[PDB]
Amino acid sequence: MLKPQQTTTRDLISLDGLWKFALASDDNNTQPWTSQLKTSLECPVPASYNDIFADSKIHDHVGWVYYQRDVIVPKGWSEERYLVRCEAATHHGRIYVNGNLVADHVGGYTPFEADITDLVAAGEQFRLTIAVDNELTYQTIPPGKVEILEATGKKVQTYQHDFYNYAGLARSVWLYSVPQQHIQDITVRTDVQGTTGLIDYNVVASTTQGTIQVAVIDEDGTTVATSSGSNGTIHIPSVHLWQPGAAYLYQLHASIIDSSKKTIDTYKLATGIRTVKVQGTQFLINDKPFYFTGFGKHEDTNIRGKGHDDAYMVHDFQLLHWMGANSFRTSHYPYAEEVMEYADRQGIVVIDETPAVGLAFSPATFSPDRINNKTREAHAQAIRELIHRDKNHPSVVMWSIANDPASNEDGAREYFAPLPKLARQLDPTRPVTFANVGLATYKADRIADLFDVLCLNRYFGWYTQTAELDEAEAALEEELRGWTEKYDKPIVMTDYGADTVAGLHSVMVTPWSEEFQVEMLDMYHRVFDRFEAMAGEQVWNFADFQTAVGVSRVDGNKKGVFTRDRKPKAAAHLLRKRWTNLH
Amino acid sequence: MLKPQQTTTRDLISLDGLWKFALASDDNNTQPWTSQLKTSLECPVPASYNDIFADSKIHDHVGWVYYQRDVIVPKGWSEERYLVRCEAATHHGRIYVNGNLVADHVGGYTPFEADITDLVAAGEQFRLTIAVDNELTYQTIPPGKVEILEATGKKVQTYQHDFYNYAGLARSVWLYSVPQQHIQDITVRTDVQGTTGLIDYNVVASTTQGTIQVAVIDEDGTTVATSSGSNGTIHIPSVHLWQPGAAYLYQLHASIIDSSKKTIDTYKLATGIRTVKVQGTQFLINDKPFYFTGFGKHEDTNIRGKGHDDAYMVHDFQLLHWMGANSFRTSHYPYAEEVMEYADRQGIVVIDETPAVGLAFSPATFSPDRINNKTREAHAQAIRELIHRDKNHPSVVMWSIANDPASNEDGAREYFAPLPKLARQLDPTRPVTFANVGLATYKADRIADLFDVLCLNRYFGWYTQTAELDEAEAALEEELRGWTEKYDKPIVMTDYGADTVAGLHSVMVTPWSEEFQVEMLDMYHRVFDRFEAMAGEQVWNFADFQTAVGVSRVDGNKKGVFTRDRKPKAAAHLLRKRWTNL
Ligand SMILES: CC1(C)[C@@H](O[C@H]2O[C@H](C(=O)O)[C@@H](O)[C@H](O)[C@H]2O)CC[C@]2(C)[C@H]3C(=O)C=C4[C@@H]5C[C@@](C)(C(=O)O)CC[C@]5(C)CC[C@@]4(C)[C@]3(C)CC[C@@H]12
């Protein structure tokens, strides 16, 4: 269902706060959810739990953890229908109402919920336990594999992606109410004919006794159009288009109306009128060529892990405007819905990506004992959920299906082939892409032709022709010449960068140094501007972020242009100079 | 005497190395130079001793220390005269040969020596003890005062300058030989008539029996002119000039010649043909206007303190060339002589400066109980020794008499007046300056008219309390207007910058961030470029350096554009942008 909001017809209670917290264990208490949890530990919920507690055992935990609290359903909600919703449980969430399992969800970055109307009476209190599991298998979306250290028996988690496997309730939890007859879903699609804007809409509602009205209201509160029925086409004269760098949002009120013209349900959906098209080598937004500038990001801050944070969100966006970035990519998982809403209002463009990173063991990655058909089922599910959630965001301009898959290997094409089609079939308003790793050159990649736009991640300066910038220039150039001569598509660079410790400086060519970072980004730009087919450049990464432990990671990933606490490295000023002095 | 060298007639022995080291104490060994020091400590000799031992007592020590080692005079110096020289002992040095005092010297940054010819015989070993004192008084030229912490009894050294009071033998020590008849000094003075270069020379030699010859050899080895006599004028047709862009150096060989045609003594002095001139607000090198770019520096590196270091010197000059900096000032004491030679070869320009910093207690600074005429003598003495040693360097383009005196107070003009006259008199070929502090505004200062070029130190602190850039800008411009209306002289900004920790970053305007330092330098430049009379900009400082302890000092002074270990802050790149262009 739609992201819940408070209306004249719907109530919404935040369940964020401190919750009682416990790890699972091998105790005579298998089944925590059946009674009041016994812990002195409280974990705040919009948070990953790993770094909260300054305890190694919680942090390194593999398997289930339990959050618990008492909740009271408002007495004035009799005659209504109500649900508990998790915006996200990373990676596998279960919801329990007093000992009853009521939901079981498997991906780590999308919503789920349970209708508890008939299980708990209005004005009743109940014990809400949400179990969350972090275990990654070859069938989970980021895939991974649990192993056991030989000498100690410590359970340990392997995976093939960078960012740390933060787990828990990294996004908000909610109790909300909906009327018996309610709106369940809305799809809006937006074209333009000359200066007239056209909204294709479809409303899905629980019942049909009494009907659907729609109103489109501009930023001034003026109703600009109306329509009747659960689906149709709304004409808007002299539309205020939604543009990169100049958002405009209309406000689409779907109501349910009874036999009298009395309102039964209402829901307010923000929509931007905008078109995306790929014509040969150009990426077009409202029939105007567009060039991405900005970053791959991560949901990651000093203590709350992947926990959504309003201050860092508003600030991060403020830093984007400051340096003239116009976009970012939801690198390696869908971000919080509230970030997409904020991008819509800020006029920021978004490459929206599924959690499907780490489909690469470089042993054959696409075989029965690795990424296999059941894995592809999970991947298809992730695509559906993401698209289902973010279909109405004008900011979201393209779906990224995966990140660094081993798209050079036998079996990779048979694995991915259905996936671009599924996305295009669920949402025909946007192009589909994926982010290509260096192994999969223009020669070796065997997947690229099934996508509408090509995204490349490349580290010539850092990882291969190390500190040898001229050597990296030549190989970068060759490569790009290969892609441009082989495909007639837009090419957006989505990773390029270098680990850089703030404060570390050198007059020489010195990796990890602030000067080196600048020298490399600067060179990459020089090469980009030589190629007409480039449609975007997004630096890796916006900010330093935590990764799994490893001798080649200095307390995480330091390829940020800002520090974890958002202080600018020299590179940040270079991009600022570049992106504000060119379109 | 002249900086010693190896010639065909002269031998030179380095005495650098590890020496035995002891602090003074109050036991019956009241005279350590009268016998072998049995201490187990060894201190390296081109170095300050303070951070070397990882020991508090030694670092914080106030008073004398003793260095010691044996030396052997070579067998073949029989017919020869021989000396022990310290390039520098900071601040007060004594040389002992086996229980006998043979030299006592007071300034901390210039050389001294002793003729030991008659005390020790060729082929003899002797015990060399060198006592060095670190105490400052109101009469030492950087002045200070020793005090006692009442609760602990601890002896403590107060002073008014920034940089830490490092002591010891910060510079090399030598045993050397010279014939009985020898050259003792040479003065060269260079000038231009059309395209022909002129060299006035004067040679001072220990005896006048048998004459003096001079040859002037070019960079290709060609003798290009000669002269006879102890003094004269040599003409160099179509001279290649020494320029800031591009050093060219002639090599002048002064000799003493016996009745026959036989060389008895010889000495090789590098000379660059160049003029310096002030005209109105313009500083002219070889008749064309010059704009100083670069730094205030310090002799400061991580362990050895003020000890001279060939590596850091070459690198520091590469970094200057890297950022297109064309000059620096020897803030705030003469630097190693080798730096001045190296500056000559590198084509870099030098404001050469005395130890006279800290003549300011902001109680009346210039008065009989504070900085007085006895102090002025040490100061005159300091000018004398600096000019005598650096007079022949083409890189040295101006003398700086003092840094941050209280030039706004009563007594200040009467104290200073003799000093620039003295400098111009010992060297009439260069202009004289001093670095003026923020208190001495164009109104308040009462000394400035006695100098040829005005050097201002104007940290933004003087102008704004709360690190507000627009406030700083309005006040700097007002002040510079005052100076340009009231004096017809070149103005060089000799201190400007911001304390800055490497790695501290902010998208806001925040002091102590790399961004703030950048923005402040940049705003200062915009202001300087609005004024025709500006002849120069030297940022304070080149690199981070150690200071006395202050809660306002973060393990030293962090105004460096480089870190102590020579890493660039963002400010270095900003300066590189400006100086490599215009
Ligand atoms: C690590 C990834 C998947 C890729 O994405 C990463 O970006 C950042 C990072 O590298 O730290 C982080 O955001 C995070 O860790 C990841 O998202 C970056 C590129 C990547 C490291 C590849 C390379 O950089 C280069 C490789 C070369 C190329 C190869 C095969 C060739 O084509 O000739 C020669 C050998 C080698 C080392 C093979 C591995 C890759 C393709 C590598 C390391 C794979 C992983 C990539």
TrEMBL record, chain A:
Alpha-D-glucuronate binds at residues 162, 459, 463, 553, 557, 559. Keywords: Glycosidase, Hydrolase. GO terms for molecular function: beta-glucuronidase activity; carbohydrate binding. Residues 182-274 form the Glycoside hydrolase family 2 immunoglobulin-like beta-sandwich domain. It comes from the Eukaryota. Residues 276-583 form the Glycoside hydrolase family 2 catalytic domain. SUPFAM superfamilies: (Trans)glycosidases (SSF51445), beta-Galactosidase/glucuronidase domain (SSF49303), Galactose-binding domain-like (SSF49785). Residues 14-179 form the Glycosyl hydrolases family 2 sugar binding domain. InterPro entries: Beta-gal/glucu_dom_sf, Galactose-bd-like_sf, GH, Glyco_hydro_2, Glyco_hydro_2_AS, Glyco_hydro_2_cat, Glyco_hydro_2_CS, Glyco_hydro_2_N. One of its GO terms (biological process) is carbohydrate metabolic process. Its EC number is 3.2.1.31. Belongs to the glycosyl hydrolase 2 family. This is Beta-glucuronidase. It comes from Aspergillus oryzae (Yellow koji mold). The gene is Pgus.
